[PDB]
Amino acid sequence: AAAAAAFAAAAAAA
Amino acid sequence: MERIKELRDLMSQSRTREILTKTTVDHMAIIKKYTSGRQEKNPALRMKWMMAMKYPITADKRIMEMIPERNEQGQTLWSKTNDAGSDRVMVSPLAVTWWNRNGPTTSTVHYPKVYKTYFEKVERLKHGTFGPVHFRNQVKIRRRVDINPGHADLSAKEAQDVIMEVVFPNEVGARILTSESQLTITKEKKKELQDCKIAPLMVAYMLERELVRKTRFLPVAGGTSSVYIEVLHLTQGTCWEQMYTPGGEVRNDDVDQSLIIAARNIVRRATVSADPLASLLEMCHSTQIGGVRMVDILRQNPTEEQAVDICKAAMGLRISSSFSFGGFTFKRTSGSSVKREEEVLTGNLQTLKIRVHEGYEEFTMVGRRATAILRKATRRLIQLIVSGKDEQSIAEAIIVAMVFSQEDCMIKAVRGDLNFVNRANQRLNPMHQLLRHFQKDAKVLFQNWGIEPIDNVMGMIGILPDMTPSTEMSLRGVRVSKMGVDSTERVVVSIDRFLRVRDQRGNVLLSPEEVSETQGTEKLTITYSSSMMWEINGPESVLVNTYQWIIRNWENVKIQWSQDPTMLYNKMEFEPFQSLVPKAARGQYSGFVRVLFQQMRDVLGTFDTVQIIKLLPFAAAPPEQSRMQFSSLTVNVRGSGMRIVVRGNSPVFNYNKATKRLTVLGKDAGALMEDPDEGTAGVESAVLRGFLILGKENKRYGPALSINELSNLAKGEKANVLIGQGDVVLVMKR
Amino acid sequence: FVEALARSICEKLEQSGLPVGGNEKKAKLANVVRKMMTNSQDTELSFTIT
RNA sequence: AGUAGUAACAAGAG
RNA sequence: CUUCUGCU
RNA sequence: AAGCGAAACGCAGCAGACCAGGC
Ligand SMILES: *O[C@H]1[C@@H](OC)[C@H](n2cnc3c(=O)[nH]c(N)nc32)O[C@@H]1COP(=O)(O)OP(=O)(O)OP(=O)(O)OC[C@H]1O[C@@H]([n+]2cn(C)c3c(=O)[nH]c(N)nc32)[C@H](O)[C@@H]1O
Ligand SMILES: [Mg+2]
């Protein structure tokens, strides 16, 4: 059930 | 092929051979700029002086075979002389003109494709629309704005990766394209740059311009989008605004952001009105975003936001009741909460004022790669169930949930160099800074969050700080579901007169109290078309225009204040200003100012034009009697509480007596006409509630007193009080 | 290296208006001065030395 | 002479 | 003399 | 929301006697 996330302003963790 | 022949020839020469053999590729970067010519320290004079000599330009030695040494008039186009420090010959500007006149022509269909950044400007200016020019008191605030929007789906690295791959496919190196966007752009550029003889450096520079995002600090008054910043000089002036609508399509994110800012300003302004629903409907029908009426935009753009949804409910559309936070769409399924500012100390000793939410609440978070069910209380995460598709997604969702919790254990987990104020010293959103910091590094937060035992439940698996799942231990109130979590749906709602949205069962879904208090800036310029054209402007503009309106209508305002002040206070022109006065102190300030005006009217004479102009906007809200004495009145401006001093001049509100001019926040508001009825005669009567300022102290009635201590006086007695900027004055209690 | 260290330190100092430039400098100065004037007590006389 | 002003120019290097 | 130069 | 230099790499056993001791 792939879904979007509307507004977003984040990058990937490490 | 001739490059190898040139290399052989260079090898033949002794000095050149030694240079080529000894200098490594690493050393090339240093010898590449090894010159004797020092940078001109006065280029204008040198250019003006050199244009007079015969051969000021330098051209490639090849020109000698491409241009005759002299034209039909005998003027020498070039000279056999060699430029000092290179093989370029020295030529006159006649050579440039001759080349442009009858030089070798070539096809130029590639230029619009390679210079797309420059040609798009012309293309969008050609289709631009110009509205009326309105003269106003423009208040341009300095902030960072977009010069080159770049590509929204590519970062610096992604842009360079495409650039290199498109311009220098062989020199790409070990880098590899890893995104559908990068592949599509690379394919399109390669298809467009077929048989392009333009210098590769220019192609790379133009591609960098078009792709890498660039921002600069500019004094803006309208939209901050690139389509608007480029024409900033034409649109926003010092005393006028030119309604302009740039051609082409606009980014959906810019429209969504602009709509959010406009809706938030509209609800914040309509909340202090007598009929909030009617005011909101009128504002929404009059407002336009980038030349498009907000009325028709709300019916096509969801932009889930505590203000957008409200506006939609007012308009009758079905709302989403959802808000986006950290890339996750949160839907409050149950519970309610109330905002309140709280002072906290982070792990790096910084102190912040975060908007803590009180009350138990339950949310559903939907993300591009995760979905979670969250249940939180006041600064505490009760439970969280994540259903992310990937381990990285699980980590991202958990970090967002922890930051959203606002738990003290997370605030204390902040470590290293984290700044809550930018280089311009502006106050950033603490939640966003925390989210960014913890997404950059979450090891410390996971280590300090805490661990709890797991109740064995089918389908629920715990997760440990090292990200490996466990069945016996897990992070405090954290579970991972492998079966998925359920879904977006719009529910019709009813909105009452006071903008309190309720569902079919009467449960209140949205209220104006939860709308964000941050006064942001719109990406796309917002235009208002009512008599009070500054109704939905920012704080500084609202203050300056409010006082300007008061001064312009002073000949009537004075009569109304002297005759029917109760009806004057209810004038709609003061409602936007009331939007900036704190909600808690609104009634106190209104009651205090109303009493001060009444006492000034009772005491014959003592009329003070400057005091009336300064305090009139604070009387609009309903009175709330109190014994409190205010030395200054606070108004919110972009998160800062500006203090207006009741007595005297302050930088926020100043009256220059020499020029008889009023300045608000440094912006001129107008001149005050000479009033024969003023007659101050020393006594003020408008500084303290129930007390008259007699004048200079005399060291007889008392050494000194405080503003609150003055309440001890019963009646008639005179005493010295220290009121204002260290100015002790004699006062009398009625 | 010494200038790089000083620049890194100055970026964290509110009163240091050197590393920034252009409108960014004017914005920093306006914000800083504004806050300084604000936090000042209403009963305290204020003066500016230039 | 003049420019100009704390020291130059009023050509200089072959 | 002629050659070279007007930021070196 | 933000933003600067605007190749190649987890051992191993005697066994068989006899004695003393353990519940
Ligand atoms: O860039 C701005 C904003 O544009 C104005 C933009 N933005 C929001 N939504 C969208 C969108 O859908 N599409 C686009 N393109 N842009 C969008 O996001 C930025 C937000 O900036 P800012 O105004 O500083 O954020 P703000 O609105 O003030 O608050 P924020 O921190 O993001 O919080 C968002 C909502 O979450 C509420 N909230 C936070 N917490 C911790 C809680 C909580 O614990 N309980 C409840 N009930 N609510 C919480 C915030 O109050 C706010 O309502
Ligand atoms: Mg036994």
Supply the DSSP string of B59-70, one letter for each residue. Answer: E-GGGGGTS-SB
Q: Is the CB of B48 under 7 A from strand F?
A: no
C14–B421 CB contact, under 8 Å: yes
Alpha-carbon distance values, B690 to B394, B409, B732 (Å): 63, 50, 9
Long-range own/partner contacts, residues B257-260 (CB < 8 A, 24 or more apart): B257/B522, B257/B523, B257/B524, B258/B223, B258/B289, B258/B290, B258/B522, B258/B523, B258/B524, B258/B525, B258/B526, B259/B289, B259/B294, B259/B297, B259/B298, B259/B301, B259/B303, B259/B308, B260/B303, B260/B305, B260/B307, B260/B308
Q: Which one, of B320, B319, B342, lies nearest residue B331 by Cα?
A: B320
Cα separation, B342 vs B353, in Å, equals 5
A2 min Cα distance to partner chain B (Å): 7
Using only C-alpha atoms, chain A has a radius of gyration, in whole angstroms, of 10
Asked whether B211 and B163 are in contact (CB, 8 A), the reply is: yes
Residues 1-50 of C with CB under 8 A from B: 11-12, 14, 19-20, 22-24, 26-28, 30-32, 34-35, 37-38, 42-46
Residues 6 or more apart whose Cβ sits within 8 Å of residue B632: B643, B644, B645, B646, B650, C42
Contact B432 A9 (CB under 8 A): yes
B554-563 and B539-552 are packed helices; what angle lies between their axes, rounded to 10 degrees?
A: 80
- From CA B30, how far away is CA B27, in angstroms rounded? 5
Sequence-separated (6 or more) residues with CB below 8 Å from residue B133 = B240, B241, B242, B243
User: Chain A partners of B441 at a C-beta cutoff of 8 Å?
Assistant: 14
Residue B372, beta-bridge partner list: B365, B386
H or E element in which residue B357 lies: strand B351-358
Determine the Cα–Cα distance for residues B209 and B189; give it in Å rounded to an integer.
Answer: 14
Contact B184, B211 (CB under 8 A): no
> Quick check: helix, strand or coil at residue B473?
strand
E strand map for B608-686: 632-637, 640-645, 653-656, 661-664, 667-671
In single-letter form, the type of residue at position B321 comes to: S
Strand F lies under 7 A from the Cβ of residue B638: no
| Method in brief | cryo-EM
Are residues B371 and A3 in contact, defined by beta-carbon separation less than 8 angstroms? Answer: yes
Q: Do the beta carbons of residue B478 and residue B462 sit within 8 Å?
A: yes
* Cβ–Cβ under 8 Å, residues A12 and B368: no
**Distance, angstroms, CA B41 to C1' D9?**
21
Please give residues of chain B from 177 to 236 whose alpha-adjacent beta carbon (CB) lies under 7 Å from any atom of strand F. 213, 215-217
* CA B387/CA B431 separation, integer angstroms: 23
The CA–CA distances, whole Å, from B660 to B165, B200, B543, B617, B652 equal 66, 63, 19, 20, 16
Cα(B288)–Cα(B460) distance, integer angstroms: 49
- Best of C7, C9, C20, C23 to disrupt the B interface by mutation (most B CBs within 10 Å)? C23
Classified as helix, coil or strand, B301 is coil
To 5 degrees, how large is the angle CA B451–CA B455–CA B461? 75
- Determine the Cα–Cα distance for residues B330 and B401; give it in Å rounded to an integer: 10
SS3 B363: strand
* A3, B368 Cβ separation under 8 angstroms: yes
8 Å CB contact between B34 and B28: no
Q: Which of B424, B641, B723 sits opposite C31 (nearest CB)?
A: B424
CB neighbours of residue B70 within 10 Å: 12
Q: Which two tokens stand for residue B656?
A: 């220059």
Rounded to 5 degrees, what are φ and ψ at B440? -65, -40
Q: Are strands B361-366 and B288-289 parallel, antiparallel or unpaired?
A: unpaired
Q: Do B640 and C46 touch (CB under 8 A)?
A: no
Cα three-residue angle B365-B369-B373, rounded to 5 degrees: 25
Residue B421 CA to ligand 2 center (angstroms) comes to 78
In what helix (H) or strand (E) does residue B263 lie, and over which residues does it extend?
helix B252-271
Closest residue of C to B640, CA-based? Answer: C35
Do residue B725 and residue C12 have CB atoms under 8 angstroms apart? no
From residue B143, give the alpha-carbon distance in Å to each of A9, B146, B215, B436, C28: 20, 10, 10, 21, 10
Q: Can you say whether the dihedral through the CA atoms of B321, B324, B330, B334 is positive or negative?
A: negative
- Relative orientation angle of helices B180-192 and B156-167, to the nearest 10 degrees: 30
Cα-based angle B195, B196, B201 (whole degrees, multiple of 5): 145
> Residue B219: which residues within 8 A CB-CB, separation 6 or more?
B140, B141, B142, C23
**Which contacts of B193-198 are long-range, i.e. CB under 8 A and separated by 24 or more positions?**
B193/B110, B193/B113, B193/B114, B193/B166, B195/B110, B196/B110, B196/B114, B197/B106, B197/B110, B198/B110, B198/B111, B198/B114
B253 Cβ contact partners less than 8 Å away, ≥ 6 residues apart: B152, B523
User: How close A4 comes to chain B (CA, Å)?
Assistant: 4
Resolution attained, angstroms: 3.1
Nearest to B643 among C12, C23, C42 (CB): C42
Nucleotides of E under 7 A from a protein CB: 6-8
* Residue B251, both tokens: 């980014």
Which of B155, B437, B439 would best serve as a mutation to test chain A binding (most A beta carbons within 10 A)?
B439
Spatial separation of the C-alpha atoms in residues B64 and B78, rounded to whole Å: 8
Shortest-distance nucleotide from C4 CA to C1' = F5
CA atoms within 13 A on the CB side of B467: 16
B721 has which bridge partners?
B729
Question: Cβ of B80: how many Cβ atoms within 10 Å?
Answer: 8
